[PDB]
Ligand binder design. Sequence first.
Ligand SMILES: NCCCNCCCCCS
Ligand SMILES: [K+]
Ligand SMILES: [K+]
Ligand SMILES: [Zn+2]
Length: 620
Amino acid sequence: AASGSALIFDEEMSRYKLLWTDPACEIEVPERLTVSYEALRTHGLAQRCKAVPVRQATEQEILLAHSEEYLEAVKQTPGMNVEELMAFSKKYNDVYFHQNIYHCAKLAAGATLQLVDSVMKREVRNGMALVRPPGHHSQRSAANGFCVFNNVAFAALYAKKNYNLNRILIVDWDVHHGQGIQYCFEEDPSVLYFSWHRYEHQSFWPNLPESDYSSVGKGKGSGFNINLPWNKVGMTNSDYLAAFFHVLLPVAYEFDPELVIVSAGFDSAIGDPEGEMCALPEIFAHLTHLLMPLAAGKMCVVLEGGYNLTSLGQSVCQTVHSLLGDPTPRISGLGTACDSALESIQNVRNVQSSYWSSFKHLAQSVRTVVVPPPGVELTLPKNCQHSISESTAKEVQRIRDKHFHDLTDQNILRSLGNIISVLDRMMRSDEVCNGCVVVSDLSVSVQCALQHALTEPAERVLVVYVGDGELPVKTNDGKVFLVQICTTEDKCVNRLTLCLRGESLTAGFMQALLGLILPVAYEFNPALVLGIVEETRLMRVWGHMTCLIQGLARGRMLTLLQGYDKDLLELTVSALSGASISPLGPLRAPKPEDVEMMEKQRQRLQERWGLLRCTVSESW
Ligand SMILES: NCCCNCCCCCS
Ligand SMILES: [K+]
Ligand SMILES: [K+]
Ligand SMILES: [Zn+2]
């Protein structure tokens, strides 16, 4: 039922600055906050979001994650002169205090809870809070690393207390380790913390052994703290995505969180003087989009770091773009992760394998267009449409006399005539985005759709098809890759066929969609995705599938549904229109026959498609 997307911001949080000379903190300036809002203003996104107002956080909300002794210590800072403030900040590591910092810290906190209420009250689908100071480094009784109060921690405790939540996912994609978040929920299994961060074998700030993949949680919460330590700088987009596909996304879907909260730090981006990574701002449109099908979209993004005033604004806009459902930009040049990345991904997978057994190994403004059958009318969301013109049918009959001399079924040449002009509408006219047509028979509809697609032009076409038997698709020339889910052996590299027989069919389809299907497709970088579903059901996953694949081809997907299914066609096109995606509940474990099936496919393909690799290669 939820609709919009909240943007909480207030220029008041830019009214505090570092005063004395301090090389540690000089990177943390008020312009971080104004540059990123005026960047949202320029690109026309800030205006597109419900502007929830900032509030102060009550002292009983602050005591949720801090001690009265440290609350009172901070509470006295507004009365101090700079002789007294630079003495109070020396008591902590890499943090500075201002006359207004306590006031703004309460705003940064309350602005987060404002966002939590907005999302959880179904008032908005998701949202982001542009706040200052950051949060993830502050602890129960200490300010640390530009942070005063742990904003993201408040949101989790707050949503737990005031909404009776059992499963919250915190994703900290800032490039520093949020130790205050890990400390807070260390023994807590209801808040699943994930943090990737620049480690350099403990050489980088905050220089903690708890930031390592060693630490997984104390007591009854063990397995709900996940640290991915980057041990070398210069991480590429492929490094960030392989981390999602192979540790974060598999854990998040079998965790099935009821609310996703993000520590959005953009010092993890290229050009940041502190992160020294190489991920482009576009990657955050995908890190955001890959997380949308969790918690039915209820996602609360909260700003942390990001210190290149140029590179900061660009990545903030890529994030809000995907929150509003705008098409995610294609990512080219993707490949295998770097060797150290594969090292730490392999290490963290192993330690956590005793808690998530999906990690075990054998010992060694119109968006969508629908075309239902004629005479069928249906109720559709506010970004959909229906059907042919003279110049379209001219080619449709041309195609007939050349390749289909013996086919006179007026139902099917309406199948093909629509297929052509929806593709003409998607690629050529650039008006509509996605599409779904219900076709009569496939051998003619699939062949017609694919061949007309390459001449749009479509440099590369990813084809996802569920059902048994081969199709009329030539997969040899390298301009088309085929994913098939059926009930068969495999030979060439540009294909991938899966057969899972079962009650865990929805659990295996996910562990194979994140483990295999997504990493291939992202490296493949198509211009168009072609979905095909034959009449031969089990649709708990199609919504998630049809949603996560739209990270490719800049969203442009066409679906061929054979045989009208009221509840199926309703499921596909709402995933295409961008609606919230229904959770699966917690994902159970797949069968050993099916995971042994999967690793046989990974090792068979990971040489051409390096994004499949989740362990570092054994040199010959
Ligand atoms: N060059 C000195 C930086 C000290 N480390 C501060 C950590 C700030 C991260 C907040 S996201
Ligand atoms: K982090
Ligand atoms: K935890
Ligand atoms: Zn940071």
